[PDB]
Design a protein around this ligand. Structure first.
Ligand SMILES: [Zn+2]
Length: 257
């Protein structure tokens, strides 16, 4: 099975998933001086006031907070998107040290972690069908830097103990994702893919310019999770990020100048 270790890491993925060497793979390095300001990009419209979180789960490669996506409760629209996209989950990627952890990079700078808010295009009916389309998913990427604590993130941090190993899940209702957003919604956008197998090229990436800060104690909790299942030898869940891939003739557009 794939993972992030020496023998099953990102550099090995292409053997089981040849699309790993595709034309629109993610993540990528965002060269701020090469990105084109596009005055036709509309502002992002995030409506998370009716969001219904349900469960938090350690899937062996990261932890996900799942949302009820049976209706238009929490949606994303506007920006470079056409149509309505429903929030299905959010997850993180982090490092073993504060100087690495993010998937995307800005002018080669790596952040301590990267939060992904995953949404699927409703015109396709369900998530499974959406992942098979060029414009099936829209993922909002938010960088995390170490500094002051993020209050809205604490509820997530506190429950990590109960989902330490692979396969564990816990009820996680009434969590408000709005507490994880930065002040500004300025962003960069480019066509890309999922950053973990099956690595499908079905994502419109919307990466926020402004990072949010979390405390050292907060990220330390992420690092206590395990890749392994219960009763197995302990392997700390750290550095679950894929390195930047070649841009290959894609243009990164910016909503700001
Ligand atoms: Zn992710």
């Amino acid at each position: 099975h794939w993972g992030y270790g020496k023998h099953n890491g990102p550099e090995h993925w292409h053997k089981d998933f040849p699309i790993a060497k595709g034309e629109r793979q993610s993540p990528v390095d965002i060269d701020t001086h090469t990105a084109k300001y596009d005055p036709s990009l509309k502002p992002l419209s995030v409506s998370y006031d009716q969001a219904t979180s349900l469960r938090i789960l350690n899937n062996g490669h990261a932890f996900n907070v799942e949302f009820d996506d049976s209706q238009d409760k929490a949606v994303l629209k506007g920006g470079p998107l056409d149509g309505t996209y429903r929030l299905i989950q959010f997850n993180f990627h982090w490092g073993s040290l504060d100087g690495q952890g993010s998937e995307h990079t800005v002018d080669k700078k790596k952040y301590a972690a990267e939060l992904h808010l995953v949404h699927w295009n409703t015109k396709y009916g369900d998530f499974g069908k959406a992942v098979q389309q060029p414009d099936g998913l829209a993922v909002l990427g938010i960088f995390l830097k170490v500094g002051s604590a993020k209050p809205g993130l604490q509820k997530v941090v506190d429950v990590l103990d109960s989902i330490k190993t692979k396969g564990k899940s816990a009820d996680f209702t009434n969590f408000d994702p709005r507490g994880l957003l930065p002040e500004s919604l300025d962003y960069w956008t480019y066509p890309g893919s999922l950053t973990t197998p099956p690595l499908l090229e079905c994502v419109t990436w919307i990466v926020l310019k402004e990072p949010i800060s979390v405390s050292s104690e907060q990220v330390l909790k992420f690092r206590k999770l395990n890749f392994n299942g219960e009763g197995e030898p302990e392997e700390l869940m750290v550095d679950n990020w894929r390195p930047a891939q070649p841009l290959k003739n894609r243009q990164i557009k910016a909503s700001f100048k």
